[PDB]
Amino acid sequence: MNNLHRELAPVSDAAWEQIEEEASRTLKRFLAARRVVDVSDPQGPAFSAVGTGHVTRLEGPGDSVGAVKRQSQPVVEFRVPFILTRQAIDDVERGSQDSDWSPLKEAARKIAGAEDRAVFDGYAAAGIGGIRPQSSNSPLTLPVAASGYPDVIARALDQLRVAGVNGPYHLVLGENAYTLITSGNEDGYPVLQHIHRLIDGEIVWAPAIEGGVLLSTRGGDFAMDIGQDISIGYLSHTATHVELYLQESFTFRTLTSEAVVSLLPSE
Amino acid sequence: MNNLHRELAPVSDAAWEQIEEEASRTLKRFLAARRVVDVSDPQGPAFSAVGTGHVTRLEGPGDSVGAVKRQSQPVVEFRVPFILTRQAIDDVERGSQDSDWSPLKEAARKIAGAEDRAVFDGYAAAGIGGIRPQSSNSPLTLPVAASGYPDVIARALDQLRVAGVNGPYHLVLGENAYTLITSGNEDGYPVLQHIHRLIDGEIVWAPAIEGGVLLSTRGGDFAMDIGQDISIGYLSHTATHVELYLQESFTFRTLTSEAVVSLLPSE
Amino acid sequence: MNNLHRELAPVSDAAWEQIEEEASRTLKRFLAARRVVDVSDPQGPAFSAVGTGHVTRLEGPGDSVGAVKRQSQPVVEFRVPFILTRQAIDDVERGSQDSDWSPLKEAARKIAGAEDRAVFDGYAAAGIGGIRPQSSNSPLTLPVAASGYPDVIARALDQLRVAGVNGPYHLVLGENAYTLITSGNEDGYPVLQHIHRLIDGEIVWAPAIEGGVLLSTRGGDFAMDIGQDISIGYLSHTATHVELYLQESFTFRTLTSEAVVSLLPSE
Amino acid sequence: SGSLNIGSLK
Amino acid sequence: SGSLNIGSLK
Amino acid sequence: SGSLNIGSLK
């Protein structure tokens, strides 16, 4: 028994397997920051802070003794609860293949959105700066039409090159920008082929954010330290419902501020 | 080369050996808290914080997502500089055996006193509570005469026993209390033999503190996490002097508040 | 110990490794001439001149004795100093991953720009003619719009073909020309695919120069003799700063003047 | 135990 | 390197 | 010793 009191839940093994498969699929579909960010192996439940290497001067203890305090970034824990109806859970053992896992999918969407917004836009309460607000390059506004995309991307690339940043360049686009770029132009311009000539991978789809980001994936610029990966735990149950939750524990740091350019949503 | 730029100092190998021997001797004579406290092995220069296991509720990121921040205690660094005259250093290679290492001894005394006062009386700037102010037992005042010592110690022991605390019981006394207890009584009372019948070790001498402490050394109550042990580093030199420093890096936590009784200095 | 007195710098091994990694990355991102020019292996610190094979007639020593002096091109040394704050250096040993290496990056940019401008535009003081001013072909002006690029490149290629020059043909473009060619056209013309049909490699990005160059990389036309590759050396330090420098030692000769066509920046 | 082992998707 | 290795004196 | 060994990038 660990803090996820899974054995206390009135949930059969087959129902657990189906729930885990659904959660993994939905999270992999929704998680965008993990595709362009250095993700460490899970460091365990005891992992509590990451040392930044910097110090802060203190008022001295006394006679000619100087003191400095080491600085660190704390780890944050995200939890999202959801409720299953106990009819979907019991139907699995009876051979059901269309049990209602919608609350689990909504919880997965919520937690993935929270994680993505913390990594990209920042979470001030947890001490997470965010990739975009902590960029030293000048932000660029996205165009209204898709034909304007090759012009912006190129300029963004130039900034990276002028900053001395190397390595593959990856583009992350929000829902509106992604659907605008992928829906084609009515003038027959092949903007998609030109963009894929400029960028070094598939365009990443990010439902949680607005606008976009062009960033280097050489490694060592954006560190995501994982204490606990997303896992399912049990809270309580009634005669007709079961309380579960999705939980993760992580911290994020931006190490190189010149390795990312933030694209603002079009006006 | 590490942060202690020892190879940049105009100091010969023999002088380094003599300096290290003197520092080790003086520190072992002056360091008192390390005799009654769980001291870990040095954890390296990167060691920056210790996780306490507790969490603090945050304002949520958004839609039905709850967040908690892990709590930790930061590591503190103590540095004390001292100056040698370069005549004592050069005389060592010429066969000197009475080179003046007084500044080194004074620096060792200063750093040992700072460490002891942080561990026993607390250091608020570094987040160190201290053993005595974080005691849940009622403090006892020490007597004016040595004959009163067996009465106080026994009562202190009773408190520990009433608190359910087990394990060997050790007494740490400041300079005045130690010299009063060891100087004998003029009535022929053997208070020392009675005290050694009550306590489970040698009395610890603590020049840095006033009063005393009676505490259990069963283990697991007072944790001293060492990042860097006391070491000698180099700062700068002139034609006739060398700047060195003594440096240590640690954090201290009191885990069991009922396992110590603080004895106040006599009035 | 060599002329780069690295052991005298108050810099730890980890800080040295991080500094060298950053310098290598930034230099590889900024160095453009080395991608289209024959670069020799480093010939050592004693390498002082390169013999051109030609002679100059002298006034004779005396009775019916004729004298000729061998001609050579001297080697030039480039040095760029920069200052680090000693807080970034010391933080590395404490686990820092975002130490400020901006002065190093600016020095790398400066030295790469000086090297590139010497190789392409020439450096009269060092006796370096330069690739572009020493071209026997007629220079071509670049167009204002990207659509005009296939017309110019083709004509430039024709010049090479008319000159009897063979081998792969490579295009080097300055920042404005590169960003204009890569930003696409608003008429849907695929100028990039046509250009890559005409040229025999990736377009080289040269932040140091204006305009461009189309040149053959068959080998034996542009010789860069390296005495000392770019290296980091130490000058001096204060209590809060360290003086380092980036240094290189080389000479450059253009051997075939008909193997390059210089493209002038657009007006 | 209990984790989905999503890890890195890069 | 450079430490005095005082450690624990208990 | 001390060089970055950039060499040729062709």
Residue numbers in the entry:
A (entry chain A), B (entry chain A), C (entry chain A): 1 to 267
D (entry chain B), E (entry chain B), F (entry chain B): 337 to 346
Text lifted from the article:
Encapsulins are self-assembling protein nanocompartments capable of selectively encapsulating dedicated cargo proteins, including enzymes involved in iron storage, sulfur metabolism, and stress resistance. Encapsulation is mediated by specific cargo protein motifs known as targeting peptides (TPs), though the structural basis for encapsulation of the largest encapsulin cargo class, dye-decolorizing peroxidases (DyPs), is currently unknown. In this study, we report the structural and functional analysis of a DyP encapsulin system from a Gram-negative pathogen – Klebsiella pneumoniae (Kp).
To overcome this challenge, we utilize a heterologous cargo-loading strategy based on a small and monomeric cargo protein (SUMO), fused to the native KpDyP TP, which allowed us to achieve sufficient TP occupancy for cryo-EM analysis of the TP binding site. In particular, the C-terminal 22 residues of KpDyP – containing the putative TP – were fused to the C-terminus of the 11 kDa monomeric small ubiquitin-like modifier (SUMO) protein via an 11-residue flexible glycine-serine linker. The consensus icosahedral (I) refinement yielded a resolution of 2.4 Å and the resulting cryo-EM density showed substantially improved signal for the KpDyP TP. As such, a ten-residue TP could be confidently modeled (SGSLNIGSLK) highlighting the details of the TP-shell interaction. In particular, TP-shell binding is mediated by a combination of hydrophobic, ionic, and H-bonding interactions. The three hydrophobic residues Leu340, Ile342, and Leu345 of the KpDyP TP interact with a geometrically complementary hydrophobic pocket located on the interior surface of the encapsulin shell protein. Multiple hydrogen bonds also contribute to TP binding, including interactions between the TP backbone (Leu345 and Gly343) and encapsulin shell residues Arg34 and Asp229. Finally, an intramolecular hydrogen bond between the two TP residues Asn341 and Ser339 appears to stabilize the observed TP conformation.
